[PDB]
Amino acid sequence: RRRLLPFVSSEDPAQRLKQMGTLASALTELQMEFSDDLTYSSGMAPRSANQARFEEGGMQVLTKEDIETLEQCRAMCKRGDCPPLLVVFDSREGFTVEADGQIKDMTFIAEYTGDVDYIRNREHDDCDSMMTLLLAKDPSKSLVICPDKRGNIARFISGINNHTLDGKKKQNCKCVRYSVNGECRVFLVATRDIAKGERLYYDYNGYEHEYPTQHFV
């Protein structure tokens, strides 16, 4: 029974302040507001549209044990105990996220946050950071998280190149969708032990193949 693990925040308060500063710097660069939750804005999807029972083929449910861990991590972030992560600009990838301390295998990294909208409303959208929330049998019910105006660290995490022979080797975390109180939720979890300085990478095409990755480093 693989249990979700809470992250271990950097012990030095100055290291936590510096980490939080790199995220605030990147958000400011994209003219974004920090948001550690899913937001339901006007002219977009209402909170009522976000029901995991609409997921074609159903959605796995987050256990009480794993919800407790998720609540612990959320409460930790509220008081200033962020996961040990640094947002770093790279000339070949743009903004990237690296571990600024050890992250054990099965450790909760972050929830993918931003504005929830209908997929039907974003067919023409240029946002490079859209993440599937709900895939329904009727496509006009499907939802996407849009961190263009509001979001957190998750929108800055890099993806693997799905076309190269060795590109899968870079993956050290995974994005998963779970039902929490009957709603869809998107989370990032470590898939192996990650060392300080190690850049985070997950598979952007973990279910659909809607993200072009051929040119990825």
């Binding site: 979700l4 279910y207 072009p212």
Partner: peptide, 14 residues
């Protein structure tokens, strides 16, 4: 043309 990241809804983490 819309690029979208996607994650599975089954199979757990590991």
């Amino acid at each position: 043309k819309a690029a979208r990241k996607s994650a599975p809804a089954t199979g757990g983490v590991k």
